[PDB]
């Protein structure tokens, strides 16, 4: 799915829902002036893609990355 936004307030005018495998992704920006949330994917081949925030795969990948930023911490020590 591809969505086009006549709106002039957001930098993402065109969003895609097509799956982007994790191995080709460098980084993902989350933007909560623009009245809607944006997810901008920086691919490993220097291209940029705005992603449909409602796509299932991107919600699943974000859940994984958020759960991992607390799972590779050093193991605390007590007493």
Numbering used by the authors: 2 to 33, 37 to 83
Publication excerpt:
CXCL13 is an agonist of CXCR5, activating the receptor, resulting in downstream calcium signaling and ultimately the chemotactic response for which chemokines are named. Furthermore, we were able to utilize two of these mutants to solve the first uncomplexed crystal structures of human CXCL13.
We found that both V1M and Δ1L2M CXCL13 functioned as agonists, with EC50 values of 5.64 and 133 nM, respectively. In terms of efficacy, V1M CXCL13 was the most efficacious construct other than WT CXCL13, attaining 93.6% activity at 1 µM, whereas Δ1L2M CXCL13 was only able to achieve a mere 55.1% activity at the same concentration. The loss of contacts at residue 1 are a likely culprit for the significantly decreased efficacy of this construct, suggesting that residue 1 plays a critical role in triggering the activation of CXCR5. All monomers exhibited density beginning at the N-terminal residue Met2, with the exception of one chain that began at Glu3. The final C-terminal residue varied between monomers, with the shortest monomer ending at Arg72 and the longest monomer ending at Lys83.
